[PDB]
């Protein structure tokens, strides 16, 4: 089975071509922490710790072109599928993990064995290592699940509230001309307030979820970075 | 001065980007693509009827049946298949003629 | 239900179907055509890359002796749990 | 005798149970901000930094509530 379809970004692609045929400075980035990993001077890393910047920026652009514009009615999030997000996060996370593993430095994993020599090795430390190794994959899964669920829930709620607002506005506006106009006015004002609140909340939540999505990957990378001191 | 992004053409820069900048990511993506097309590229007729149509399956015309009919007609005509062969029917040609005369 | 139906791609244009057997056979024909010429010796890494993994997977499939039944991958109906056929 | 029964209305019950998970999430979020206020009054110079950490905690806590809310939609729409 081969389905031929298209993304919902063609107009946005046209706008990108129109408005970016000439250069422009960028000074505001959703996830700025990918550019500043080291905060104490004289510390440097031999690993390619700045390799994630390009992917981070592209992912932010793509997910912002989809999610932020999805607040416009009838705009489609073409990628909104659980397993597709799983594939994306699998790609990024496993690629970085295999980059660390191909280094063939086993000492890098010494920190997995949690605790000190005082703790019993078999009954405490080994179990903790098992849990942490499980927790890496669980972090991947939680990242993709969170990204999926936030969008799904937000858009379900928006659709339901908009349906209710349409119903009351269309089939009960005549109450403005009736003696119970005050009740309708109160309800309409409440609905407007709810509309504004929901839109603001969704706008903020989209950006914050993208921030967290990139921060999980950067945390994976940082957990295995080692910094040398200049002398 | 020479820079990959400014001096090289798009296909060359693409190859360089995914071979000397993000090769592991490309490898993982290809692996995942192969997995998807190996295990997630099939849809049964019942699944299509349940979920494969925007408004629901139009049983009043059964387009799946027409599609399969066209498929099988094309295969038979092009491959010169004798559908009256005993293996397809489970009985000899003479028995088939007897049945036709009976019914 | 109806709200759930809003989360679908909105620009579906065409759907094509093809049997696994048919396109696998076509791919095998292409691979044989490109790996047949004499100027590609059987001991070359390219030829082995092309053939060895496929041979290994097919051998593993043939050697399989499972006590359970695996329903046909391409049945007409795979949605009924109580009918593997 | 073998009798198979399929009750349709049960999906409402399971949906309502998942919503209870939001009680912990909603409470958990309020706990974060309560500490934020009690912390900004102890060291106002870091109010901007603390506000940033509070928001991060809100999303992580909020994320869990969505998991439950997804299950509610799944059963409510099936």
């Amino acid at each position: 089975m081969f389905l031929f379809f298209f993304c919902d970004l063609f107009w946005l692609r046209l706008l990108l071509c129109m408005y970016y045929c000439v250069w422009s400075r960028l000074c505001f980035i959703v996830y700025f922490n990918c550019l500043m990993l080291i905060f104490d001077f004289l510390l440097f890393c031999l690993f390619d710790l700045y390799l994630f910047v390009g992917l981070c920026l592209f992912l932010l652009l793509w997910f912002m072109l989809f999610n932020l514009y999805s607040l416009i009615l009838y705009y489609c999030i073409t990628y909104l599928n659980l397993y597709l997000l799983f594939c994306i996060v699998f790609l990024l996370y496993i690629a970085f993990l295999f980059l660390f593993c191909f280094l063939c430095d086993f000492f890098l994993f010494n920190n997995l064995l949690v605790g000190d020599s005082f703790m019993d090795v078999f009954f405490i430390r080994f179990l903790l290592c098992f849990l942490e190794c499980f927790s890496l994959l669980c972090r991947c899964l939680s990242t993709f699940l969170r990204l999926f669920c936030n969008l799904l829930s937000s858009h379900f709620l928006l659709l339901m509230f908009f349906d209710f607002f349409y119903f009351i506005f269309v089939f009960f506006f005549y109450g403005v001309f009736c003696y119970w106009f005050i009740l309708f006015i109160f309800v309409f004002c409440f609905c407007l307030l709810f509309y504004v609140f929901l839109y603001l909340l969704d706008l903020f939540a989209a950006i914050l979820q993208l921030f967290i999505f990139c921060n999980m990957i950067l945390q994976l990378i940082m957990d295995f970075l080692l910094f040398l001191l200049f002398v | 001065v020479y820079t990959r992004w400014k001096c090289d053409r798009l296909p060359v820069f693409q190859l360089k980007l995914f071979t000397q900048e993000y090769p592991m990511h490309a490898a993982v993506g290809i692996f995942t693509i192969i997995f998807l097309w190996k295990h997630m590229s099939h849809c049964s007729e019942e699944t299509e009827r349940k979920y494969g149509w925007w408004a629901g399956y139009p049983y009043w015309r059964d387009p799946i049946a027409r599609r399969n009919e066209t498929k099988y007609k094309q295969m038979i005509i092009n491959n010169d298949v004798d559908i009256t062969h005993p293996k397809w029917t489970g009985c000899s040609v003479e028995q088939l003629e007897e049945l036709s005369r009976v019914v | 239900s109806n709200p759930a139906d809003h989360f679908r791609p909105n620009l579906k244009a065409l759907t094509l179907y093809a049997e696994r057997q048919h396109y696998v056979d076509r791919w095998l024909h292409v691979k044989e055509r490109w790996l047949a010429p004499w100027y590609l010796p059987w001991w070359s890494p390219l030829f082995q890359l092309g053939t060895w993994y496929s041979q290994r997977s097919r051998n593993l499939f043939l050697v399989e002796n499972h006590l359970s039944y695996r329903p046909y991958k391409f049945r007409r109906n795979d949605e009924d749990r109580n009918n593997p056929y | 005798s073998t009798v198979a029964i399929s009750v349709q209305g049960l999906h409402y019950v399971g949906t309502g149970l998942a919503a209870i998970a939001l009680a912990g999430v909603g409470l958990g979020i309020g706990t974060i901000f309560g500490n934020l206020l009690v912390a900004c009054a102890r060291q106002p110079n870091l109010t901007k930094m603390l506000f940033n950490y509070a928001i991060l905690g809100f999303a992580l806590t909020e994320a869990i509530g969505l998991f439950a809310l997804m299950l509610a939609f799944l059963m409510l729409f099936s």
């Binding site: 397993y83 | 693409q14 980007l17 995914f18 490309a26 693509i33 097309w37 299509e48 | 989360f7 | -």
Partner: peptide, 29 residues
């Protein structure tokens, strides 16, 4: 729900893979 579906997952993911392998270089340059 299609978001939880898999009957055309491969074709659906081709969009992301095209964006990653073909559109990202153009945006990069």
């Amino acid at each position: 729900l299609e978001p939880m579906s898999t009957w055309y997952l491969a074709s659906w993911a081709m969009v992301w893979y095209y964006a990653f392998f073909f559109w990202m270089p153009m945006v990069w340059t």
